[PDB]
Ligand binder design. Sequence first.
Ligand SMILES: COc1cccc(COC(=O)c2cn[nH]c2)c1
Ligand SMILES: COc1cccc(COC(=O)c2cn[nH]c2)c1
Ligand SMILES: COc1cccc(COC(=O)c2cn[nH]c2)c1
Ligand SMILES: COc1cccc(COC(=O)c2cn[nH]c2)c1
Lengths: 211, 214
Amino acid sequence: SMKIDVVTIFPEYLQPVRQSLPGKAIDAGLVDVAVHDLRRWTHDVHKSVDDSPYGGGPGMVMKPTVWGDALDEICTSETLLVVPTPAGYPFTQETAWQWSTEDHLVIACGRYEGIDQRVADDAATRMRVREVSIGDYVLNGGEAAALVIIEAVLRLVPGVSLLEGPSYTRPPSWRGMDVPPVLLSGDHAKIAAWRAEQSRQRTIERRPDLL
Amino acid sequence: SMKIDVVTIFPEYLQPVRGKAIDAGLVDVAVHDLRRWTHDVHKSVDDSPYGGGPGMVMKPTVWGDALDEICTSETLLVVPTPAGYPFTQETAWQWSTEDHLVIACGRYEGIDQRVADDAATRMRVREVSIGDYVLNGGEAAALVIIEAVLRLVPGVMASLLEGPSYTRPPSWRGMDVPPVLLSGDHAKIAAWRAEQSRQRTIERRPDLLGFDSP
Ligand SMILES: COc1cccc(COC(=O)c2cn[nH]c2)c1
Ligand SMILES: COc1cccc(COC(=O)c2cn[nH]c2)c1
Ligand SMILES: COc1cccc(COC(=O)c2cn[nH]c2)c1
Ligand SMILES: COc1cccc(COC(=O)c2cn[nH]c2)c1
């Protein structure tokens, strides 16, 4: 059983993962994903969510007063507050495994430059807060990162070292290229060693950092 | 001006592109249902892996037909996969100058490798990872790549992590903005920010400064 709340100024962005849920998953109370428009918590007629950064420099910083109200209403002391940001700790498969057993995730989607730091600092005094990066690149908003995180976590919720080498399926011959004959050999010990070497070679070529 | 074609068995999931509204006509984003190139009755796109293993592998025949119609020799064929070369900010900059990206979204355990090998004989192919986690499909990863690239396209920050940012009010729930940021001293602000950045990078990403990861 897991509840995910997403707070964003683009709630429509999250509508695909809402419907991506199996009907037998949400009916069983194993998962409910709710999306909230951040502007619900704005204070002015202009529904402002950002303001200029202290200490200058082009870019806009999201307002702490608005975010604080939103989190005040949505978060509980049991909440795991996830803040996607390119300045975050790495979000990896180990993280997804860890978060897969959480009762309540709140994902705060920020917009470039970021969210006033006091929001996270304040929240962290009564809940667990995790600023995380899904990758070394910059997005205009956290929304796509939320999709990634939601998918990587939920697929580890039951019912909701090296790189892997190439995979093949039918036909055995296609556009002049044959499936590696070892895979059709019925020698499963040999297949395993073949696959291990394929993985070692691909990892060396693509991710030497992993060795 | 850039064309992005995305190929997927879940074209619905790509509605979030509608966002990075290309209303300015600086890019056209097209999404294609892979099942459109099938001939079967049940329109099968996958099958069990040769050599055994878990899950299913997407068939090469369907993908070959789809890529034939959609790609040219000038296309950059992008295949999100956790087994790919890393997609980073540097990659985003590089791809921001491309005429034509085609993004092949895989599902299940993967796409028959011969799809990529075949395509590489007529176009440039890039198998890429957007990060070290596993997804059910390439769709979300395509969204990430599109966002990272499109915001760099002409007409629309790497080595360190950026430090914290603040805005009004100068005090909030008893928490004050760092006084230096209120001081109007550009040099001291630059110095403090540079320091916060380095301090955050060593704490969260020691690898970026050439130290052992925790
Ligand atoms: C909340 O503060 C910010 C600031 C800047 C951009 C974003 C959007 O997230 C990303 O771009 C990202 C997440 N992981 N890798 C990249 C959020
Ligand atoms: C070590 O860093 C990580 C973390 C998570 C996944 C991976 C690679 O997984 C694959 O190569 C794969 C999975 N399905 N098909 C290919 C690497
Ligand atoms: C090639 O077909 C496959 C196979 C396995 C998973 C996926 C989805 O992509 C990812 O999970 C991914 C991309 N970068 N980091 C994770 C596609
Ligand atoms: C080294 O790899 C990368 C790549 C891209 C960005 C970053 C860090 O960016 C930020 O911290 C940020 C940018 N806007 N707001 C916060 C690191």
